[PDB]
Amino acid sequence: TELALFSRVNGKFSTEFQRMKTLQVKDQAVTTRVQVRNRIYTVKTTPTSE
Amino acid sequence: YLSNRTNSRVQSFGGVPFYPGITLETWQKGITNHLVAIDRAGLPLHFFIK
Numbered sequence: 207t208e209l210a211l212f213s214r215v216n217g218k219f220s221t222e223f224q225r226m227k228t229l230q231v232k233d234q235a236v237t238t239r240v241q242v243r244n245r246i247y248t249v250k251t252t253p254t255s256e
Numbered sequence: 257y258l259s260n261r262t263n264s265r266v267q268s269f270g271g272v273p274f275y276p277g278i279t280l281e282t283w284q285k286g287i288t289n290h291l292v293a294i295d296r297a298g299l300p301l302h303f304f305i306k
């Protein structure tokens with residue numbers, strides 16, 4: 207600010223603004239399935255075959 | 257930081273070919289045949305040579 211009635215009447219407003227908005231989302235999904243089946247039903251050769 | 261970890265292990269012998277969505281029942285009712293020797297006892301074969 208400034209004022210006077212004799213020699214020095216002025217005005218000033220050196221207003222400033224600095225804003226910096228930074229976001230950082232970071233998502234990481236990971237799925238891993240493994241599944242295994244087994245069956246048996248056995249068979250032998252007869253001990254007297256030719 | 258989420259982390260599921262699921263296991264599963266059926267081990268059947270012996271009924272109808274198992275599958276995950278099977279009830280604990282349709283297993284049983286389907287045991288009509290599909291029987292399996294779950295326990296056994298015998299003798300040394302030299303005993304049978306008489």
Ligand SMILES: *[C@@H]1O[C@H](CO)[C@@H](O)[C@H](O)[C@H]1NC(C)=O
Nearest residue numbers: 235257258259260261262263
């Ligand atoms: C698996 O993770 C989900 C979230 O995605 C959770 O709700 C659940 O309880 C966890 N376990 C199973 C068996 O789904």
